[PDB]
Design a binder for this molecule. Structure first.
Ligand SMILES: Nc1nc2[nH]cnc2c(=O)[nH]1
Ligand SMILES: Nc1nc2[nH]cnc2c(=O)[nH]1
Ligand SMILES: Nc1nc2[nH]cnc2c(=O)[nH]1
Ligand SMILES: Nc1nc2[nH]cnc2c(=O)[nH]1
Ligand SMILES: [Ca+2]
Ligand SMILES: [Ca+2]
Ligand SMILES: [Ca+2]
Ligand SMILES: [Ca+2]
Ligand SMILES: [Ca+2]
Ligand SMILES: [Ca+2]
Ligand SMILES: [Ca+2]
Ligand SMILES: [Ca+2]
Ligand SMILES: [Ca+2]
Ligand SMILES: [Ca+2]
Ligand SMILES: [Ca+2]
Ligand SMILES: [Ca+2]
Ligand SMILES: [Ca+2]
Ligand SMILES: [Ca+2]
Ligand SMILES: [Ca+2]
Ligand SMILES: [Ca+2]
Ligand SMILES: [Ca+2]
Ligand SMILES: [Ca+2]
Ligand SMILES: [Ca+2]
Ligand SMILES: [Ca+2]
Lengths: 63, 173, 63, 173, 172, 173, 63, 63
């Protein structure tokens, strides 16, 4: 039902807000949410890379 | 063959040295722009042209060889087509309301804070950008994305530079 | 649902684009997607190795 | 407290909106340079002046308030004095043989490969730099050193930036 | 058929009982004249020194029996592939034909690598003759084997110092 | 500038496509070498010339533009001078006893085990290297040192490559 | 010192060549040698900092 | 006192033997001994770098 992930990611995607994605190993990826499904986020910076949600700790908006 | 005609234009433009200088670029761009009276411009000036040569000069000869000129020229033709299509009010200029669509069509997905910074630094008091400013903005934006990509090897969205790389990427431009 | 992973990995596989696969411990594997299912990616470099998706953080290509 | 006279000059130069635009800076620089026939120049153009305002515009108003203008003005008067002193052949231009001395006097201790890149980007086919190009080069060089200093908090000689910080620091003119 | 191979080897190798670059060149130029299907300006000495160098894993400067057998068996297999993937019967391998031929040889390469091979081994029409094709595959095979042996943890990445680098790039 | 001689030579060599192919390079090298019968040589062959073009072809056009040709031509002139000077027995060839001194003069300070590997691959059964073999060896050795230096950024004497960088740096020609 | 250190550091200083200074903990400092004595190197990047020679592993130029 | 290290380094230098130099933090440098004095070793690979002896654990040749 009241999934909070989809609205949150869609708002980042539509307004092209830069995000930091911290992985469970503490590494920081930065770019824009191009796309996402139940299991992955397509993150676009200079390449388009696939990030598994199971490897993410946090999505932090820049603004 | 259409690539053969393009090499003929390059060789004519480049003259005695086999390279296109800032002044040869300025002269050919001011000639092309006058045959398109739909493109409002106060002209390409020498300093804008030195900058366009500088960011395209990947082998540091100080001038554009064939491959550097082809990349620049094909970008300018593509961005000329975008300028006309996204000039929805037919002002001959790109307004603040038009610039996001034009840059998106050029393949730059930027946030409003960056569009505001661009309009502040490239547009006039009415927030309108003329054709030389638009081409100059895109040549630099394209080069700065390419410079960032080449330094972002692990694809993390962040790069590390010392002062010499910083001066090369900020002054050479 | 799982609707973004297959298209993304199949495009890497078909065009034989080299990918970097970062594991959750930060280690980098490089080669080609030979194939994949719900749980694993067969990565080909000089051997053909099985990589568990649960141990992957990111799959970054070279476009 | 003879800085009240300087503040009065600023308020006169700024007019109504109490900030100095790119156009107001261009007009006052072109006025000053005509009083010095010692300074060879094709004039300060709008693009060079928008660039100088942009790198000096610390509060992002798009124009120069008092402290931004004072810093820029004091730098321009000091660099004017250096230009004349290091113009040893009295050409009204700074030649590649003269540039290292002038930049050293301005407090920039750079290596030959950086001097060579500056001459390639700011000087003409004879390796001579006119006054507007020399001032524009130093305004940018000074700003790029200050931007690097402010991001190098641990003083390691290396800066880490994402694409938004990169575009903010590089998208100039 | 191992019997036939040892007879050929002894005859080809002569006194020093190893195959030099010159002996390899002479036997390859002899074989290729019996196949007017194979367009070639001939195997030259520099291509043959290169083939001996990448196959000379015991560093004698020439090919002993096992080095020659490995090379010879590769050449026979690749000759068969060359003819089969020459679809327009030009006697040469065109840019459109090269991917299929290399795939059949067991090299699954991306188009950017095919483009650089055609740039370096093919003529101004993008056609590769027989000596160029054999020379390309002997090197490609050797460079894959060298990479495999240095990628012990299977990460797709190897580390070399300047001596290993010069051994792998110059002795070729 | 008196680099007009170079430009004249390049334009005459390059013909219609205004770039120097492997075939055009082979033809000019075979002409130059016949003027010097004290350079023993069986001739520059097409495969050696494709290899020299490949390592010098920085912009991947498959042929040598002006700047790529100048770099190669300047190296060949310097190495021709070294060949004659280090040919102490006047054989017209560089012997195993001569090769260390010649390579040291070219700027390559290598250990005996590497000199032996070079002799094994580029010299004849008497350990003598003829002129085309010497130039071909130096063009490759120079390129392989430059490739290694550009990947060894931390200067640790060790490089890391994937299979595509490896195939790019090793497949020649 | 009395053979190789002074000439080496003076050549860096005079030609204003950028150096990396690696510390014994593996941290990399980049700038130009402003000056040096028996015990320290003054390194200039944007500030002028004092680096103890006892904490340095390597001084590496770019030429 | 340095009656064993000078002959050892000089033999490496003269015969141009590749050495691995391990630093006290475990990092490995490879090149040729260009030169050395009481306090430093000039190591040459593609650059010429100054290595402080106080930061060295071992010099491992391929002799
Ligand atoms: N893109 C990317 N993903 C990672 N996952 C873990 N480390 C990295 C890294 O360096 N880059
Ligand atoms: N193939 C491979 N998988 C790993 N997983 C963690 N480390 C490694 C490694 O070195 N190689
Ligand atoms: N040259 C060099 N010295 C070091 N000291 C510690 N780490 C390094 C490194 O990566 N390179
Ligand atoms: N010989 C040697 N010395 C070291 N010092 C630190 N690590 C090493 C190592 O692996 N080998
Ligand atoms: Ca020109
Ligand atoms: Ca150029
Ligand atoms: Ca409009
Ligand atoms: Ca304009
Ligand atoms: Ca990165
Ligand atoms: Ca005003
Ligand atoms: Ca302001
Ligand atoms: Ca002068
Ligand atoms: Ca000017
Ligand atoms: Ca820092
Ligand atoms: Ca024999
Ligand atoms: Ca052997
Ligand atoms: Ca064919
Ligand atoms: Ca051939
Ligand atoms: Ca590995
Ligand atoms: Ca030609
Ligand atoms: Ca080229
Ligand atoms: Ca001799
Ligand atoms: Ca020869
Ligand atoms: Ca390294």
């Amino acid at each position: 039902g009241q999934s909070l992930q989809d609205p949150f990611l869609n708002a980042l995607r539509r307004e092209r807000v830069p995000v930091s994605i911290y992985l469970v190993n503490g590494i920081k990826l930065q770019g824009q949410i191009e796309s996402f499904d139940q299991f992955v986020i397509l993150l676009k910076n200079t390449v388009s890379q696939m990030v598994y949600k199971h490897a993410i700790s946090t999505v932090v908006p820049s603004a | 063959e259409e690539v053969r005609q393009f090499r003929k234009l390059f060789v004519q433009l480049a003259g005695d040295d086999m390279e296109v200088s800032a002044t040869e670029l300025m002269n050919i761009l001011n000639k092309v722009v006058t045959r398109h009276p739909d493109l409002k411009t106060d002209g390409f000036g020498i300093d804008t042209c030195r900058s366009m040569v500088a960011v395209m000069d990947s082998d540091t000869t100080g001038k554009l060889g064939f491959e550097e000129f082809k990349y620049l020229w094909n970008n300018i033709k593509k961005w000329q087509g975008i300028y006309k299509r996204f000039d929805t009010d037919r002002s001959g200029t790109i307004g603040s309301n038009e610039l996001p669509g034009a840059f998106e069509a050029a393949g730059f997905h930027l946030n409003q804070h960056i569009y505001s910074m661009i309009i502040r630094r490239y547009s006039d008091e009415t927030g309108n950008m003329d054709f030389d400013n638009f081409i100059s903005c895109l040549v630099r934006l394209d080069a700065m994305f390419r410079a960032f990509r080449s330094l972002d090897k692990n694809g993390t969205g962040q790069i590390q530079v010392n002062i010499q790389e910083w001066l090369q990427l900020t002054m050479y431009s």
